[PDB]
Amino acid sequence: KPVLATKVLGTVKWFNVRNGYGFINRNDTKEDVFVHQTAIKRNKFLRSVGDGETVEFDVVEGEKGAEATNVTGPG
RNA sequence: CAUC
Numbered sequence: 001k002p003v004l005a006t007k008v009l010g011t012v013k014w015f016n017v018r019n020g021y022g023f024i025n026r027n028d029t030k031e032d033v034f035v036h037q038t039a040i041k042r043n044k045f046l047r048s049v050g051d052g053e054t055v056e057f058d059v060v061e062g063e064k065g066a067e068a069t070n071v072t073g074p075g
Numbered sequence: 076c077a078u079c
Contacts, residue, residue, distance in 0.1 A: 016079040023078060036076050064077065 005059040035068040
């Protein structure tokens with residue numbers, strides 16, 4: 001819910017489409033942030049990002065820790 | 076739905 005950062009750039013460490021989640025390493029802090037499938041903006045569809053992709057996102061405080069939201073391409 |  002609470003927004004912790006906007007317009008953050010990061011690289012997908014891994015994203016597993018069977019479990020519907022993965023992690024993004026933030027470029028500004030080098031910390032991993034959790035990314036759930038629901039947090040990825042709209043892309044025969046499978047909501048997902050690829051290992052090694054650079055993405056742009058917001059960081060919010062979730063129940064179990066910091067997580068990415070509004071995940072998109074960097075433009 | 077927290078390291079596949």
